[PDB]
Amino acid sequence: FTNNIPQRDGGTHLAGFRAAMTRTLNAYMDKEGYSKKAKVSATGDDAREGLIAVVSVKVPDPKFSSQTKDKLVSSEVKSAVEQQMNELLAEYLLENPTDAKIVVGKIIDAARAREAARRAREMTRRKGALDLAGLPGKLADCQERDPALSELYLVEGDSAGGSAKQGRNRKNQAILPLK
Amino acid sequence: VASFEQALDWLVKESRRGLSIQRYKGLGEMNPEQLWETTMDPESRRMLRVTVKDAIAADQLFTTLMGDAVEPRRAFIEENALKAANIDI
Amino acid sequence: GKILNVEKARFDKMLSSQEVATLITALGCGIGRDEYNPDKLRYHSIIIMTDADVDGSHIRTLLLTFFYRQPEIVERGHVYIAQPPLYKVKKGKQEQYIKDDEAMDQYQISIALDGATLHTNASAPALAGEALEKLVSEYNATQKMINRMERRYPKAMLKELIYQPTLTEADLSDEQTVTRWVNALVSELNDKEQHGSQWKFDVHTNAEQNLFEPIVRVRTHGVDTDYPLDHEFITGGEYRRICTLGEKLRGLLEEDAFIERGERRQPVASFEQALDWLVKESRRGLSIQRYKGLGEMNPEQLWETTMDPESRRMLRVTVKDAIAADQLFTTLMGDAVEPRRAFIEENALKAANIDI
Amino acid sequence: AREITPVNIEEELKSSYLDYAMSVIVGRALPDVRDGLKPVHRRVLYAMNVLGNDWNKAYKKSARVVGDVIGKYHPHGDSAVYDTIVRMAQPFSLRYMLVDGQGNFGSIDGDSAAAMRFTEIRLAKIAHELMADLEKETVDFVDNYDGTEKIPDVMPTKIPNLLVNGSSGIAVGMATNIPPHNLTEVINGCLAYIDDEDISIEGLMEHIPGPDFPTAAIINGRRGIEEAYRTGRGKVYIRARAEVEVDAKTGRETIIVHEIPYQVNKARLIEKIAELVKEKRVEGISALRDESDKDGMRIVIEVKRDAVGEVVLNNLYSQTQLQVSFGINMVALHHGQPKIMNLKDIIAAFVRHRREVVTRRTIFELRKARDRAHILEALAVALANIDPIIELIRHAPTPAEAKTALVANPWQLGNVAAMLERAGDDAARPEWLEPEFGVRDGLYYLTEQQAQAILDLRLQKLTGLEHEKLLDEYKELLDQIAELLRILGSADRLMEVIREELELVREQFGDKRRTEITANSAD
Amino acid sequence: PEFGVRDGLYYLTEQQAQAILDLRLQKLTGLEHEKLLDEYKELLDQIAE
Amino acid sequence: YAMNVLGNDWNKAYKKSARVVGDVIGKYHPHGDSAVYDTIVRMAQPFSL
């Protein structure tokens, strides 16, 4: 909602809410280490699965994508929503251990359900400082040794390669600039 | 305003006062933070899975568009241009 | 581009594409003494036609080092140096090629006096062209000297010293003449000052030799400094040039002086104003093209300048003294930097202090 | 006028090499002490300023700026100019960036910047203060290579760019290497010098403890800083932040490199560590990876169970590039000649440059104010006598005849001009004006410029409101002229203006220190 | 049609009034009236062409 | 169009090709240099046109 007007297609508040929830729950999992014991990494659509939430914002001068006001595209809302969620959801998780443990159990069960349906596979050597494994110099490989938890970005050149390599996630994402 | 054209043109002219567009001629012109916000971050990500609906139609399309012969390619391009010209009759 | 510095580079490093290509074209077998056969040289005229700019000069020095170190070719006189122009100038129909920057300065001086006449009085004949050219040349030389001396003294003082009366060593023994001279100099400096400076005088009662060395104070940008015109300056060889120029300009220009350049007329009151007006009027139709290497020149211009043997200008490299040449090559191109730095510093000081 | 002439090898070599050496030393290698910029940086910033790449305007492509620089000012190939622009735009090369980039400009990891056709550039806000009051003829201009355009000889900087951003260049004989510094500390040192010009180097070191690199790090010793700041040369060791983390459960330790020294490539560092591990030079390295995610810079070096961990870190400092010796060599062009100079010399040169800039700016503003006051006197006197002036212009056939009629006739001042030109009647006329003109005892004599301005007066300005506006403008210009003359009168007011400007710069662009400076047992 | 000559009376527009206020005292001389007359005749010929 | 806007008139002095290529790529042509210069070279040379 934005000034008591429902948004069908979400908006910037919805994106900030989702990002804050994912970051906070991943941080809690990493801090407590329950994901390590479960041997599965929670991602998006596991925290959000089986969730009910009601986001309401009061912008003075909102900017929508159309006169129907089905999507808020105000850039100021996302930072405020993300900051407030990142503080207060973490505070709530630290305050409520039992509810946090129950939600973490639900998220771990969802992650295990996701992991079960994946295709059978085997670990693969990845490019590293000590060992290259006979891979090209242009490749900027990732840390994750398991396929199905890694990505390869085929970009158009070396400049785009550097731009993508500077901003990425080293755990999962790898880049192979073509010519 | 005396006509709808005048009103629409005035609104468009008033819209483009503070506007400033930045065309990206490839990912080199994008900052890494902008790339992360737009494409790389799985939360704000929008991909498309490449899937094959019909194998025969896909093979025919690949041969026509990307094969050696130009006559099927030129005919396909001309027919699609005319179709784009005659979207609504 | 640039080639290897063979003085610094090992003999094994000589196997590079540029040096290998040059050695194949010359056909000296590409070894120093194992099979070096200068009698089988494929060209008896080897011409180093590099660009007409600074990096061209550096590449020329590198090539000369290669030819001298890797020597009988240089001694027999087979090595030449081409001199392509750096600048082209144009005033409508007229065109000309200029090599150096000093040649460009001479060309500017030539245009400034082209069809220019200076009349001292309201109705007097024009000065002779040769005399005016000599005056402008001496004025430019003294301006360069004053630019060199700008570190020691202000430029305003040195420019004003041209027009004031001379001050011989006999005057230094006197006191009233020194006070009158320095007072007149400081008054003229204060009157003509278009900046914030404030000039004042002060006499030095040098009882060691019964002299009186005037001191001129100045407060420029809030900083107060003293510039004592010592006995050395009065006969230091630099004030003599200023006095000799000033003797030609004490009262040359009268009240009704003017300069004509054909259609245009301009009354003047100082030689500087007339020279500035001539230089400004010269550069109206002028257009200068600077060649950043021979790629920017047309082939016709290259043929006209420095390929046609009729209109060519060339230099033949010769070794006047083997020992001095070897020492110069080792100092300027050796691994050691201290002799190179000392040489550069000494030559810069000599260039800035050419015979006082 | 001969086809061939003899030339000695010695004379040709000496002339060519001395020309090249002097040209390099004066024109590409060393920076000027005053503005702290090489000629390439000066020409690039001048081109960007002339184009209109302001800090609050849309980016312009690097291709356009490079093409303009090469075409107009700097004829030395586009690749070098683009490399200089890239280095100026990077946040890890310069302490305070002079260009705001938009795209890929490389990284500490070692990626090369994007090509010229991709990136876009724009002046940083610091560059505008670096080029402040350029239009007010505060610095001498020099014609370019063609002679068709002018370039500044030196920028009228407000920031001490040499100490702040540092420099590094390799001349033929000389070679400069000056580290960066913090702007607040350097401005405090400049203010301390202004308060007492005969200040020892110890006081400046109290105000300027040491260099401050763009990449945060640790400076190990302090003898090198003192030697550099008193002599102009000295070696400084730059250490890397590196803790030794131990997990609560297991006893295995890890070494985490938070930061690295200045001008050290992270990828080459990791390759060197991997080579040392493969060659068995360094003992106890279990693993090696990076975990930087734009939230710092993390390099995890896992330690084996049978290893101390601290010994491994000491070996890495001793052998690897985690510790680097920065060789200070403070060479810069002073009065257009190379000179090895210390901290106090640089600060004094900057203060003298600010004195010159402020004095020339005040002189230019005073001349402009006096000329405008002259024109406003003409306009007020003409509006007082509007009817006979209209009659005389109407009767005249040509504007030239009108000019002659206006100049010939002296004019009564009128009540408004009499009241206006009573307070501060003197000490407001332009310098070149002869005493013939002006208010010659109750009768105003017009010049040719004043008459021409009167003929250009529009009918819109005959209203009384515009007349009162002219009177207010004249009074404001009289006040401005009085203030400028008061600034030029005394050196204390000049120092006050300079101190106010420096305090404003420190307030605007002040920043916190990044690199820690620690003691060392070798001192 | 409101503006222009009507019953021997010229009715100015706001743009014409602004142009008149931009008129300078230099152009009140006798030469500029002939200049305006000649320019108007030339523009009438050009408009006809 | 870029050469006309710059003022590269036939009777005026020459301008460097780098400035024209940079102006074209910056303002009008989004396809990067080294291909505009080839077109300029082809248009300049007398044996192609």
Q: Is D316 on the interface with A (CB under 8 A)?
A: no
Q: Of C333, C308, C259, nearest to C66 (Cα)?
A: C333
Neighbouring-strand partners of residue C118 = C259
DSSP assignment of chain B: --SHHHHHHHHHHHHTSS------SSTTSS-HHHHIIIIISSTT--------S-HHHHHHHHHHHHSS-SHHHHHHHHHHHHHHHTS--
Domain boundaries, chain C: 1-82+299-335, 85-143+237-298, 144-235
DSSP state of C356: -
The vertex-C249 CA angle with C246 and C254, nearest 5°, equals 150
Residue F32: its chain B contacts at CB < 8 A? 25
DSSP state of C295: T
Q: Is D115 on the interface with B (CB under 8 A)?
A: yes
Q: What was the experiment behind these coordinates? A: cryo-EM
Q: Of C57, C14, C8, C32, nearest to C333 (Cα)?
A: C8
Distance, CA of A75 to CA of C3 (rounded, Å):
57
Give me D196's structure tokens. 């007492």
What one-letter code names the amino acid at A42? A
Q: Do D173 and C222 touch (CB under 8 A)?
A: no
State how far the alpha carbon of A162 is from the alpha carbons of A138, B27, D66, D110, D112, in Å: 10, 9, 22, 9, 7
DSSP state of D462: G
Buried b (16+ CB within 10 A) or exposed e, B49-69: eeeeeeeeeeeeeeeeeeeee
Q: What are phi and psi of E5, to 5 degrees?
A: -70, 130
Chain D residue with Cα closest to E26: D455
The vertex-A119 CA angle with A114 and A125, nearest 5°, equals 105
Q: How far is F17 from chain C (nearest CA, A)?
A: 11
What one-letter code names the amino acid at B83? K
Resolution (A): 3.0
C85-143+237-298 CATH, one of 3.30.365.10, 3.30.565.10, 3.40.50.1860, 3.30.300.370: 3.30.300.370
CB within 8 Å of C163: residues ≥ 6 apart: C188, C246, C249, C250
HSE-CB of D30 using CA atoms within 13 angstroms: 28
Q: Collapse the DSSP code of C7 into the 3-class scheme (helix H, G, I; strand E, B; otherwise coil) and give the result.
A: coil
* CB-CB contact of F29 with F35 (8 Å): no
Distance, CA of A167 to CA of D400 (rounded, Å):
71
State how far the alpha carbon of F43 is from the alpha carbons of C110, F11, F46, F48, in Å: 39, 18, 8, 7
Distance, CA of C111 to CA of C286 (rounded, Å):
10
HSE-CB of C192 using CA atoms within 13 angstroms: 11
State how far the alpha carbon of D386 is from the alpha carbons of C3, D176, D438, E22, in Å: 79, 67, 19, 17
Q: Collapse the DSSP code of D499 into the 3-class scheme (helix H, G, I; strand E, B; otherwise coil) and give the result.
A: helix
Mutate to test the interface with D, among F8, F14, F23 (most CBs of D within 10 A): F23
Q: Do E28 and D389 touch (CB under 8 A)?
A: no
Q: Of D268, D294, D110, B45, nearest to A151 (Cα)?
A: B45
Residues in chain B: 89
Residues in chain C: 356
Distance, CA of C255 to CA of C270 (rounded, Å):
10
Buried b (16+ CB within 10 A) or exposed e, C223-234: eeeeeebebebb
Q: Do B29 and D119 touch (CB under 8 A)?
A: yes
Neighbouring-strand partners of residue D8 = C318
What are the strands, taking DSSP E only, across A26-172?
Answer: 151-155
Residue B44: its chain A contacts at CB < 8 A? 15, 19
* CB-CB contact of E37 with E30 (8 Å): no
Q: Collapse the DSSP code of C290 into the 3-class scheme (helix H, G, I; strand E, B; otherwise coil) and give the result.
A: strand
Q: H or E stretch including D415?
A: helix D415-420
Q: What are phi and psi of E28, to 5 degrees?
A: -80, -5
Neighbouring-strand partners of residue D170 = D175
Helices (H), strands (E): how many in chain E?
2, 2
Q: Do D460 and E22 touch (CB under 8 A)?
A: yes
Q: How far is D99 from chain F (nearest CA, A)?
A: 18
Residues in chain A: 179
- Report the relative pairing of strands D516-517 and D218-219 from DSSP bridges: parallel
Q: How far is B30 from chain A (nearest CA, A)?
A: 7
Burial class (CB in 10 A: 0-12, 13-18, 19+), B89: exposed
Q: Do D460 and E24 touch (CB under 8 A)?
A: no
- Report the relative pairing of strands A151-155 and C314-318 from DSSP bridges: unpaired
* CB-CB contact of C171 with C213 (8 Å): no
Give me C78's structure tokens. 């087979």
Is chain E touching chain F, with at least 3 CB–CB pairs below 8 Å? no
Give me A99's structure tokens. 């509810």
| Torsion of Cα atoms, D281 then D287 then D288 then D294, to 10° | -160
Q: Is C53 annotated as a binding residue?
A: yes
Distance, CA of D458 to CA of C173 (rounded, Å):
68
Residue C289: its chain F contacts at CB < 8 A? 13-14
C144-235 CATH, one of 3.40.50.150, 3.20.20.70, 2.60.120.10, 3.10.20.690: 3.10.20.690
* CB-CB contact of D267 with D109 (8 Å): yes
Q: Do B35 and A22 touch (CB under 8 A)?
A: no
Distance, CA of D324 to CA of E20 (rounded, Å):
76
The answer for D361, left when phi > 0, alpha when psi is -120 to 50, beta otherwise, is: alpha
Chains that touch B (3 or more CB pairs under 8 A): A, D, F
Residue A162: its chain B contacts at CB < 8 A? 28
Of the partner residues A15, A22, A167, the one whose CB lies closest to the CB of residue B32: A167
Q: Of E16, E33, E28, E9, nearest to D459 (Cα)?
A: E28
Residue B33: its chain D contacts at CB < 8 A? 294
* CB-CB contact of D222 with D517 (8 Å): yes
Neighbouring-strand partners of residue F12 = none
- Other residues' Cβ atoms within 10 Å of the Cβ of residue A66: 9
* The dihedral sign for the CA sequence C173, C174, C178, C179: positive
Burial class (CB in 10 A: 0-12, 13-18, 19+), D371: middle
Mutate to test the interface with D, among B16, B19, B29 (most CBs of D within 10 A): B29
